[PDB]
Structure to design on (93 residues):
RNA sequence: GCCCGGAUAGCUCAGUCGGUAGAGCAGGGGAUUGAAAAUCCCCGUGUCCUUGGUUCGAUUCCGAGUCCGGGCACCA
RNA sequence: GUGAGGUUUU
RNA sequence: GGUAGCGGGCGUGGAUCCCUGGAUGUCCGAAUGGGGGAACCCGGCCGGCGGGAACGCCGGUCACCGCGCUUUUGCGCGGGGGGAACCUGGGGAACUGAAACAUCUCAGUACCCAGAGGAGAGGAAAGAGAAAUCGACUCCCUGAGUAGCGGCGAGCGAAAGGGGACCAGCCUAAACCGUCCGGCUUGUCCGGGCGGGGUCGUGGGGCCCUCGGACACCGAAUCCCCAGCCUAGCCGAAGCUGUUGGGAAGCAGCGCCAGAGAGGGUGAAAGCCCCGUAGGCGAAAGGUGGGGGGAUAGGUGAGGGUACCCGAGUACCCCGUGGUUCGUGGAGCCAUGGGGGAAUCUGGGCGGACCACCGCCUAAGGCUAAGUACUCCGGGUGACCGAUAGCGCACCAGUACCG
RNA sequence: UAGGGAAACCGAGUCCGAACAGGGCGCAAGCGGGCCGCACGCGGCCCGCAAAGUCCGCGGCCGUGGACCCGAAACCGGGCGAGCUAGCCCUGGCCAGGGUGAAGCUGGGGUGAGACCCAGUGGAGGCCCGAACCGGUGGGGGAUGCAAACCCCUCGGAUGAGCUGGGGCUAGGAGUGAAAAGCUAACCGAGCCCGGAGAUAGCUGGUUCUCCCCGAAAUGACUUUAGGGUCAGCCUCAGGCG
RNA sequence: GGGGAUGACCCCAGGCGGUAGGGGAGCGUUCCCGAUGCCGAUGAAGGCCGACCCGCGAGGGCGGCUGGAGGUAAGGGAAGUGCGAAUGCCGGCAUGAGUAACGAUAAAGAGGGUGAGAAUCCCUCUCGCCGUAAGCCCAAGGGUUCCUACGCAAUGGUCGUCAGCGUAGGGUUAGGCGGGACCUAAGGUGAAGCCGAAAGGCGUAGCCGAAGGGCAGCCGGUUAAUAUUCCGGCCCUUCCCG
RNA sequence: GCAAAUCCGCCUCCCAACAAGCUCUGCGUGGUGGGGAAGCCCGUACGGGUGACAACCCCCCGAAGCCAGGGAGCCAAGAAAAGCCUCUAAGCACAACCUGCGGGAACCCGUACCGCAAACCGACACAGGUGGGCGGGUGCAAGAGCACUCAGGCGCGCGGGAGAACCCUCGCCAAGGAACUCUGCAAGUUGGCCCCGUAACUUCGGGAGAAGGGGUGCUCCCUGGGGUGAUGAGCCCCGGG
RNA sequence: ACGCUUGCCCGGUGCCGGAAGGUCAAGGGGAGGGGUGCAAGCCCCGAACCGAAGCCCCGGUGAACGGCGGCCGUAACUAUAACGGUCCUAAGGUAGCGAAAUUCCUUGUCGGGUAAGUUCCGACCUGCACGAAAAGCGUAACGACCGGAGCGCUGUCUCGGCGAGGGACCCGGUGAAAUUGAACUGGCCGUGAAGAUGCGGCCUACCCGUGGCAGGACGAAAAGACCCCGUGGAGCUUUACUGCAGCCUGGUGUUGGCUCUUGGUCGCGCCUGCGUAGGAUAGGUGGGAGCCUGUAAACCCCCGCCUCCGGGUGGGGGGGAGGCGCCGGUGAAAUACCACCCUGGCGCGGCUGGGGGCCUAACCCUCGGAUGGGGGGACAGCGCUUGGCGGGCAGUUUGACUG
RNA sequence: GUAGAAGGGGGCCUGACUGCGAGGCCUGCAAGCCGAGCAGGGGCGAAAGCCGGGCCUAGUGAACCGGUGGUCCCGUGUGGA
């Protein structure tokens, strides 16, 4: 799925397996022996954030783990202790 | 094709961690046992892989591989 | 407290 | 109404018909009070009716999601679904071609999903590429089947520049400043929304000093008005006689008009029998108004000092990938799935491994008309057809019929 | 209109090369030609629209496009179907009649007590015979039939591993399967409908008016190739030699 | 090759079987320039003939009959341009041929009536068949096929006056019967929540979901067609009001 | 009882205890109402008057149906929720609930016909298939089987001649009895009930209805009973001589 | 189902276990080189070494896949095998059956059944080519299964006949079907693509029908259902190829705090060499007549240090001119003065590489009413990357000449 | 085919060269083979002359992708790689 902050999507990518040592390191070269479609995913991980309303769980990538904890200090001057444990979620940017 | 361990007597094998070497068969007669089997005894078969070198030497150590194998590639 | 690779019938 | 037939009534006091604005518009259908096997059933609240408490009906409101206000209640603004073809993004084949065939081609095509449009996408250079050059973007013709890629086989295939259609450029965060709120050490600072301040490569901009003068100019893509166009239409020249025949428009005589001798109908073959073509008028009302006049928002300058800021897990490196002609080749650039990981103009990216010089441009935020594709629909044309043609249907057709 | 060379680069020359040896590429060779300018080297001229090429038309052929037409077995994408059939879940219904007589119970015999035996009672079985019912073993008819799976007789189970009504779930490289590769809407070694797709076919068939002139071949050299191909041989047309 | 009046008209010599093919010359059809024209009721295209004329031909002229309103030179062009074959297609009509069959071997016969027409329609008297149905009542399913009156255009495997066939008019009456305003199982949808590129897929509470549970009606008559509904007797249920 | 209870569950019980009381069904009787034939006249059809003041009594067989949530046995262990009964939370106790007495209201859809076929599904008025219930009587021991026949329908929607070969179905046959054929394939015999008898072998059940046989009709007399009815008179059943 | 058993061998393969050892990926590490720049710097390689899974190797596993022999001589001729010698050997089939659903020779041989038996039954074993859980031999009951025999009875037959109904036949009514080049369609003998109604010769035959047979029209149906070809298409298999699902595994993110001993380029330091032939704690060698020495020697008493148990080398606190080697002695080599690195027990400079023990907040599971308890615990799962297994799946290929 | 050496023996050398190659055999094409002669510089022989492998016919493999030396030709703005 999509990240909650950045938005990195699971992209498709070919898995081009081949056989043969290369040109400058060998004799002939690299011949492609088979191609197949492939489904690359991101590091979608869960993290708990202790806000005084509710301990919210997120879904964020490993390259954006410090974006969440950096985003707590940005999300500290906003309205704390909201009237429901769900409205704290979508009000991050 | 780099690397890995070796080629010993018709047969296969006792080996060195550098100063050693072969035992068994289709074989002839043989103390034996009161003239019976062969327990046991002489006995027919070493370029110890081809070759170069520390070395008193090479029947044994080390270097390239011609001899055969497993993994590893690479083959337009 | 100790002894047999062990035998065959003319 | 097609559309006959019986039986009735309307119209100059303007009937029928056409166009525009309205009202009603049962039920289903995004369906949306709820259920539901679509065109059915059952309700809640507020008013009314039937003698009306119990029963029924009518008129409003009651689905979900994202926003602003409302501290919760609730009120306003949008979205859901469909659309012949087109466009963008995310997935995505196989037969065929290589006279097999797995890389490749077919092809990022058919097809599936999402949203928007009368187009979409793209767009104001971290561009292009050799000339110190061009200067947003889109489309056509060239360049050119060229350079290139490719079991270097099949085959795929640019870009630069030029001639053209069109031409519009902008907005915002950052440094600095004012209010309010949040954490709280209520210190002298942090975090967020608003108001001024900035949109740059000739580097721009914040603060301070000097030159000052704008109170003059530009100007929308926003708004207002209007020319014009569309949804109904109107005016609009000119001929008779006799004969064959059932029928004259033919034929014979004398004529007429032409800004109209296109077409169709008229018992047959007509410029002068009719409807209209030439040409000119026509809007009360509703749409368009890219065309043209006005208004506003918004823009306007030079030197010195300071080096505070110029788009963060981002540039860059490695592995795995897609696109450009680039299939891993010397493999650049554009985005990145993962790992490491800064700087803010003495900072960076690019000019095809790479190093130095020399040139171009500021990425990591967003918007943008015009030129381009297509025809459900409107009309005109056709060396287009004429009921086995043409769309599947010229006819009461996506019907009868099959499943 | 200038071409060589892989390019650099050079140019009526270039390249191979030390080279003017030698060779491969092009080059100039003269068509209409009063050209007598009066030097028979004639320089080049009236001058055929040409050596010399381009643009358009009309034909033959070819490549990419479906490319003379018809016809597959198949592949992929999106969906429709478990009202037939296969399995299963929930809820109901069906099984006439007759017999054999298990476990237990009661009574009697037995001994010290049982175990054990007999009689009655008892009515369970994937029991037996046999109806509706679900099936089709064997025979006959039916064979453009009554029927795109029947009819007459005989049959196996018929209290169950049973039969069946109603509401559902499972699906195409998948479902289900007491397992045959059966069934999945009358045809299943991978359904049906649409689209790619006018797929491909060196494989069959067909290919429409007339007249005239010439006229073949079934051979050779090669191909994961022998029924098809490329070149040559054979034929025809046009332009030149004679 | 020649006379070369260049004659595109006649002499001389040679040749004229032919598939796949190569080449040359013509005919016919749709439309277009010619066409603001010409032909055409004294008769156009098309249809049926010709023993007529021209042409080696595809064919073109002319004459007669039918037809009732279009056709188009000469010279050219563009083709959706010439059919007998493709187990081609579409529509018609043949052969098979007055042939097989006429649909369970349960079975018909006779007298009257209607009617133009009767083995087939209506009535009566005999005979046969089913009678755990070939009888009756419901749920499926079908959707006016039910009844009456008038008829045989078409249908009934023959006829038919009849018809489940056509035209018209009627006919289905519910507090108590079966469903909803009651509930639930398998299963489906689905607040919260979870997962997945999107379409979407799981999923608590709750909702839907039945031939399952609960709930108050029995007997007889009436029409050509309605009956636990209409009516006669008789008994109950739910809710509201005093 | 994811408790709030006087309700339910558990433990202490003076008692009752195979019972009785109280509630829930079915049947009979029951105020009363309806039906009332076969046969006969009028009969076009349809059917109508009828024959009555109609009778409407008794006996037996007897269900898979009702009481029902009965009883016994067995393992494979045999749904949910709603109505209704009861106790309470917030609330209300001038309310609200229950039983009577009188008066009102009861809504939307189905309703015809065929429904084991001519109207459903099979291109057809198709010898196929289609769920549930009633599905009579007599005899065969019984029975939804067989044969016939009540009520109800039907003669199957092409017939009439002759009575060739040949096809299908059926019946019969001197003598042989499987000799035909790949094979007793097909056809035929045995067949139901009661009574004697029943082998090899075995997992002791079975084989087994083994194989083999005898009887079955009708009339009269005597007699054992059982059920209902009353103890038997009457009526059904099992028999024996 | 059940009675008796599952005997032989682990060589190939599958599987399990393996802290010894070989190979190997990403990666870590990096001597030594290359390009460029005036250099500072930047960019490429890079051999040593470390580095899992997997493969190789060892053992086990046969109610795992899988198989289970030949040859020469010997007993009163024959026969043997029960005995003696070989192995492509891992191993040579044991019990129990056997011309059998197995047997080619074969109808093997004998006996029963019949008069006649290629079938059947019971044995013989000469098992091409039974066989022990792809189970071996029997077995009460049972089977719409197959094979054989007998019995009473039957047309099934020798050998047919007769009768009945529904068709067939005639008449009245309705009235198709596939096939079809046109047909005015004779036989024989020859020819013709090699099987003649049509061609040639001879013979026969008036035209047209009705009922029947099916010998012909190479009759009809289906574009052979057998065989071959197509570089046709599918289903299935495998140690045929390549990928994928899935599984194992190193690195890395999620993912942390500590501790123990081990590892690598690692020589600053410790003091390690005795098969040894003589005097031996004798390393190969380099100087080898000087220095241990009065800044505290010698028979051996200090003594940490290691040890093959002999013994030597450092702190030397009390000694007091004596230790004795270059040669002789050993030999493949001569020290005692200055150390060149191997052989090693060992302190540490660079990174901790791996293996354990504890806590745990991340993460996961779980508990009635869950911002809180319990357990696992930085492991699992998940992403990227690397290597291996992998017909479970998919795309595929498997040639041609050929009397 | 060869003794009027190509056969056997001895001396000296590597022409078992580099750039070409007129004219041909054969062939569909691709290939295969003979090659007098020119230049440079050699070997043998005093010279004339011969030597561009083997007495001859078989002893092999088109193309593409790459490896090792030289050439310094191109090398993507410039100089280099
Ligand atoms: Mg990171
Ligand atoms: Mg003795
Ligand atoms: Mg009108
Ligand atoms: Mg009128
Ligand atoms: Mg009127
Ligand atoms: Mg009027
Ligand atoms: Mg008006
Ligand atoms: Mg309107
Ligand atoms: Mg309304
Ligand atoms: Mg609704
Ligand atoms: Mg809905
Ligand atoms: Mg109100
Ligand atoms: Mg009111
Ligand atoms: Mg009122
Ligand atoms: Mg809206
Ligand atoms: Mg498109
Ligand atoms: Mg895309
Ligand atoms: Mg493909
Ligand atoms: Mg291909
Ligand atoms: Mg492409
Ligand atoms: Mg939309
Ligand atoms: Mg849309
Ligand atoms: Mg536009
Ligand atoms: Mg646009
Ligand atoms: Mg846009
Ligand atoms: Mg845009
Ligand atoms: Mg910009
Ligand atoms: Mg351009
Ligand atoms: Mg321009
Ligand atoms: Mg501003
Ligand atoms: Mg007018
Ligand atoms: Mg006018
Ligand atoms: Mg007139
Ligand atoms: Mg006119
Ligand atoms: Mg006139
Ligand atoms: Mg507007
Ligand atoms: Mg405009
Ligand atoms: Mg700064
Ligand atoms: Mg690339
Ligand atoms: Mg990039
Ligand atoms: Mg990234
Ligand atoms: Mg960069
Ligand atoms: Mg660069
Ligand atoms: Mg249109
Ligand atoms: Mg049409
Ligand atoms: Mg017509
Ligand atoms: Mg339909
Ligand atoms: Mg030349
Ligand atoms: Mg020239
Ligand atoms: Mg089913
Ligand atoms: Mg159903
Ligand atoms: Mg049974
Ligand atoms: Mg029944
Ligand atoms: Mg069956
Ligand atoms: Mg059958
Ligand atoms: Mg059978
Ligand atoms: Mg039976
Ligand atoms: Mg039975
Ligand atoms: Mg069934
Ligand atoms: Mg599919
Ligand atoms: Mg599968
Ligand atoms: Mg399955
Ligand atoms: Mg089927
Ligand atoms: Mg199929
Ligand atoms: Mg096709
Ligand atoms: Mg295609
Ligand atoms: Mg071809
Ligand atoms: Mg000729
Ligand atoms: Mg040719
Ligand atoms: Mg010529
Ligand atoms: Mg003449
Ligand atoms: Mg002549
Ligand atoms: Mg000719
Ligand atoms: Mg020809
Ligand atoms: Mg036409
Ligand atoms: Mg005229
Ligand atoms: Mg006329
Ligand atoms: Mg015409
Ligand atoms: Mg006429
Ligand atoms: Mg055509
Ligand atoms: Mg035709
Ligand atoms: Mg035909
Ligand atoms: Mg006849
Ligand atoms: Mg006949
Ligand atoms: Mg006939
Ligand atoms: Mg007949
Ligand atoms: Mg009959
Ligand atoms: Mg009669
Ligand atoms: Mg009569
Ligand atoms: Mg009469
Ligand atoms: Mg009759
Ligand atoms: Mg119905
Ligand atoms: Mg119907
Ligand atoms: Mg009707
Ligand atoms: Mg009538
Ligand atoms: Mg009629
Ligand atoms: Mg009729
Ligand atoms: Mg009449
Ligand atoms: Mg009717
Ligand atoms: Mg409901
Ligand atoms: Mg209601
Ligand atoms: Mg419900
Ligand atoms: Mg409920
Ligand atoms: Mg559900
Ligand atoms: Mg769902
Ligand atoms: Mg119900
Ligand atoms: Mg019910
Ligand atoms: Mg409950
Ligand atoms: Mg009814
Ligand atoms: Mg009725
Ligand atoms: Mg029934
Ligand atoms: Mg029917
Ligand atoms: Mg019928
Ligand atoms: Mg029927
Ligand atoms: Mg049935
Ligand atoms: Mg009797
Ligand atoms: Mg009886
Ligand atoms: Mg019966
Ligand atoms: Mg009767
Ligand atoms: Mg009848
Ligand atoms: Mg009849
Ligand atoms: Mg009939
Ligand atoms: Mg007869
Ligand atoms: Mg007889
Ligand atoms: Mg007899
Ligand atoms: Mg016989
Ligand atoms: Mg015989
Ligand atoms: Mg039989
Ligand atoms: Mg009784
Ligand atoms: Mg410099
Ligand atoms: Mg340097
Ligand atoms: Mg540096
Ligand atoms: Mg059975
Ligand atoms: Mg017979
Ligand atoms: Mg019949
Ligand atoms: Mg007839
Ligand atoms: Mg013949
Ligand atoms: Mg003839
Ligand atoms: Mg003849
Ligand atoms: Mg026949
Ligand atoms: Mg722990
Ligand atoms: Mg925690
Ligand atoms: Mg813990
Ligand atoms: Mg981990
Ligand atoms: Mg496969
Ligand atoms: Mg393929
Ligand atoms: Mg000589
Ligand atoms: Mg050549
Ligand atoms: Mg030689
Ligand atoms: Mg560059
Ligand atoms: Mg450069």
């Amino acid at each position: 799925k999509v990240c909650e902050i950045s938005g990195k999507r699971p992209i498709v990518a070919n898995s081009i397996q081949r056989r043969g040592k290369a040109k400058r390191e060998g004799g002939v070269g690299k011949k492609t022996t088979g191609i197949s479609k492939r489904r690359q995913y991101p590091n979608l991980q869960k993290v708990r954030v202790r806000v005084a309303g509710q301990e919210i769980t997120f879904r964020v990538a490993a390259s954006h783990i410090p974006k969440v904890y950096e985003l707590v200090e940005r999300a500290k001057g906003l309205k704390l202790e909201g009237l429901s444990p769900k409205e704290i979620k979508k009000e991050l940017l």
